[PDB]
Amino acid sequence: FTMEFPFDVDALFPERITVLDQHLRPPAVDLQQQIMTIIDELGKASAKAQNLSAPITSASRMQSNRHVVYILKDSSARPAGKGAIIGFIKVGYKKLFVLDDREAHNEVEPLCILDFYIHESVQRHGHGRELFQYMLQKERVEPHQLAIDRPSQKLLKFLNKHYNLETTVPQVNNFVIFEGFFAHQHPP
């Protein structure tokens, strides 16, 4: 994944952030396969960045799940003149059982952050925050209401910096939640 593709990304994705679900509908010569290729490459790049041995995001996985992907295109002009993709965030609701600090197991169904990647060359340029903000607005969720699948330390630093999030009770299910998640807690 280099950000660029052998087709015109700006024609494919007219909006700065494009939101796609299991149907992978092109915004309105196979445009859908262009989208599938972008997702495949993004997923492989994210996996490599997180030291995973295989992708957790792919076109086929999008088609077989109830996840939603937000894709950020590059709003600058590129020399090759066919646009570029910066990165993505993938979310989905999941049923979980989580332990609080009062010994209770709580059945919950929060929005979860499932994958999140910005191309290495343009990390720390604010793109991650932009994408995260757009997702929060569209999903109508606040950051402390989220669960995250096995977050990287980079993401924990990001969330503390931008949203003052602090992790709360550790779980046995590979998800992380933050202070404010439970009804008796208060967000930052």
Binding site: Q50, L52, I56, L114, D149, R150, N173, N174, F175
Partner: peptide, 4 residues
């Protein structure tokens, strides 16, 4: 979790 898909990461496990």
């Amino acid at each position: 979790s898909d990461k496990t």
